[PDB]
Symmetry: C3
Subunit: 333 residues, 3 copies
Amino acid sequence: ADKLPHTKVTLVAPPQVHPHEQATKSGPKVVEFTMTIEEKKMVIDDKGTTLQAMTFNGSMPGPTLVVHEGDYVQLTLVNPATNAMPHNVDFHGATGALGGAKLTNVNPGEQATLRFKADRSGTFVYHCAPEGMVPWHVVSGMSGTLMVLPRDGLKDPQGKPLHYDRAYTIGEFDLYIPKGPDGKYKDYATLAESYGDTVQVMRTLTPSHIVFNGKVGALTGANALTAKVGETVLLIHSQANRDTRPHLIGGHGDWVWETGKFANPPQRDLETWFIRGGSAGAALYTFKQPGVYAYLNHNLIEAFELGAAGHIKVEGKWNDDLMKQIKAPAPIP
Amino acid sequence: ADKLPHTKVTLVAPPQVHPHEQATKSGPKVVEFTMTIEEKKMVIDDKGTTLQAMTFNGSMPGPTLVVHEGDYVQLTLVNPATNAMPHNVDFHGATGALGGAKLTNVNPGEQATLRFKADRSGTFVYHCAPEGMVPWHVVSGMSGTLMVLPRDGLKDPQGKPLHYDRAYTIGEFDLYIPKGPDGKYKDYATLAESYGDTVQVMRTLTPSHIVFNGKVGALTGANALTAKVGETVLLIHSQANRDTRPHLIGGHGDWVWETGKFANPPQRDLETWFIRGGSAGAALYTFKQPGVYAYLNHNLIEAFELGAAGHIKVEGKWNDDLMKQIKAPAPIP
Amino acid sequence: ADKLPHTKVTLVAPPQVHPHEQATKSGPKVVEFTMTIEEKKMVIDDKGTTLQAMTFNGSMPGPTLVVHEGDYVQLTLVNPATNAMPHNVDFHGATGALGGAKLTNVNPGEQATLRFKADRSGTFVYHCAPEGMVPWHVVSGMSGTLMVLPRDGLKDPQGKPLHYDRAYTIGEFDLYIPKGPDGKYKDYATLAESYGDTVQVMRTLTPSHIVFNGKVGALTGANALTAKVGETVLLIHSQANRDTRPHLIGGHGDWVWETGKFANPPQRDLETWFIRGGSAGAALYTFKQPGVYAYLNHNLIEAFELGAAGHIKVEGKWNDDLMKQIKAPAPIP
Ligand SMILES: [Cu+2]
Ligand SMILES: [Cu+2]
Ligand SMILES: [Cu+2]
Ligand SMILES: [Cu+2]
Ligand SMILES: [Cu+2]
Ligand SMILES: [Cu+2]
Ligand SMILES: [Zn+2]
Ligand SMILES: [Zn+2]
Ligand SMILES: [Zn+2]
């Protein structure tokens, strides 16, 4: 690793993913990243409910980091003195020392640099895991995805090449917002004051909200995902704490790695797939119809009542072969 | 599609599935179906609890529709003036327009005809999805399965032929029946009056009942499924809203497509498989022993306490090679 | 089976597994086991909460039974007169008579001997299932694993040999301990007195505790699992009632059969896998780094708050290629 060239990557905010190659002629590199932790109060729904949140780089999820199999990830993790809590990082893509958590314990005002070999292909969760407060830091927003691409790109079960034209990253967050005796959600002045009441809600195993990318409706309206007929999209879906079941309404998972590990053959033609709590999965889809799709957790209560749903707006020409309204709604003859 | 022959299929009520070919020499057809929505109050347990239910064709689940890959499904959906609500249909097997929901919005007194290409093999959920009330219509009973068989029939991982001699269809329904201050389940005069209280229960993510085919014990006694030693059964299991884990007590899943898509290789020898909320899965089993089996969700609380269990009564000759009582229960020597 | 040699196996307590061969030159045998049921009050957490427990052989889980495909399992099940309840056993690995439950109904003071053919390879749950009280006996602790190894040992997707150097067995138990009006957990004088209150908690679908091998912290401290760099461990994980998502913190599932059936190809490089309620799964991992790992259910609330987490202490030499602390935590420059 000490023999290798270094490259520095500039991260981009979800739902985008930073520029990268799929199949590459390049040899292994030490790939350098930096992230800065930000604790902040965030508004998470349409009625002004707040979360005392904790983030990598100011977003939920943290940004997606992309490397190739055989690369080394070298992350500088910064915990500004403006934060109240200690933090660290655990990479599921890494081997040893609790995913790196033991080597990256940063108090406010400190930083650390971790290197690990990305020797396994796939999408992998990374998350904060400070001893004694792991689930709180995770459910408060401290997770994201590391994608390790095979050096020769994605492959189907027969070893044929697969690709995406655009990648989107979706972090799904089960939130545990406490209520007061009046039945309204509690607003806390500081992160520390949210703790005890939040642990109590967590222990019920019942989320108050389940959101994509930090808020009900985050991936809707002006902020809907976009694509065009004929384009192949990769949808990366991470859930660091709780199971989810992604579904594209009006579409499919053409090729899906629901356990998120690219050396395994993908499944095809899925209606709904399953992302295990503590993992990231990946689905390819090539659009064949224009229109607005929903991308959601298909526990429909979790999607429509609790917030786990987004939109994809797709341009292009309608295909009557695939679907046709033979008779529009009309009175029964 | 406009060049093709049409065929009309008469649907049958669950747990049966309408007559169809597996492997077929026939070419693609436009396959015509009709379903009529029925809102009705249904008794769902042994103690007289009622559900303000919503159904395709008067049953939970709706009937299973069977076509072959490359066929076109052409469904006439009828919403009689006797119903109170608007409805539509979203086929997970279809491509575009939110699965067809956008093209089939029928007010009471109206009907519509949708065509789509069944270009992907597998078992696929279909369900109602009226804008603004999706989870309510789904959990109240509006879902069923479309099975798209490969034109050359089912195949094992090595591409060898597989078949079933009899097919059964099981829809599992997580129900959310509200209670009054007295702790008894509420009975509502109309469908609309159940709504607000039901949404509140839904948001707890805790079903009051979880039933196969519309009621606790639906598939038991006179209504148990049946088979014989040597017969291969296909068990289609749909759950449009919540995860389940089917298990045949005393048997196995010989070949299982738990994600329900036939172009993927099945798994063999399963004890328990997993049907993701928002999907239908399929399992083959060849009976080797006579007797009464249970087919259930193997969260045993969900099965035995909440209602997610049925029976299969199997005729034939006992096999002592497979299992033998060496010593019957007797006092400890 | 009446032509075959018999062997008698002495069972060992979890988390160990009794001595056995993987690949074997031996032909099929009748393999004889005995287990004795023990009802007992057990302390399940650090604050003195008790469970009115029910066990195979005095442990949660029951011991793991290991045979080879084509062997016959012959179990003598003993229910001492000191117990209060009737019991039986249902082997998911068996064919017929509700897994053997119908043939092994033993009142206190009785015993029975069941034989069945272990004709399917994999890890399979076994559990008590007395008519009318199935979920109670299961959640109170009456489950364990039968492992049926292929006669030629484990194989990867390409049919290459796989092995483990050490096997550990982990039973995960969702517990349903009732509380009194004071908010403290109830302590019951007898097993029968726990029943009604426990059924009420069960019906909420919310466990009070979720534990590995009978107690919070069971597999920690003096009782942590152990291994060494270069050693391959098999981690058998059973959950007879509820879904779980195992994860090795700082490691991976090198080869995983999450549905637990060895005739299916395993998946590689998993971060987190999924064990369906009512099943046992198996994961291989070869250690590459020394240190203390956590092995946990990656619903981190379930792990850290409710008890579903253990430790593995690993000896050997640190590998800087795999992971290196480039800069230890230090003030931000
Ligand atoms: Cu943190
Ligand atoms: Cu983790
Ligand atoms: Cu409807
Ligand atoms: Cu749907
Ligand atoms: Cu028992
Ligand atoms: Cu069972
Ligand atoms: Zn493309
Ligand atoms: Zn047959
Ligand atoms: Zn070894």
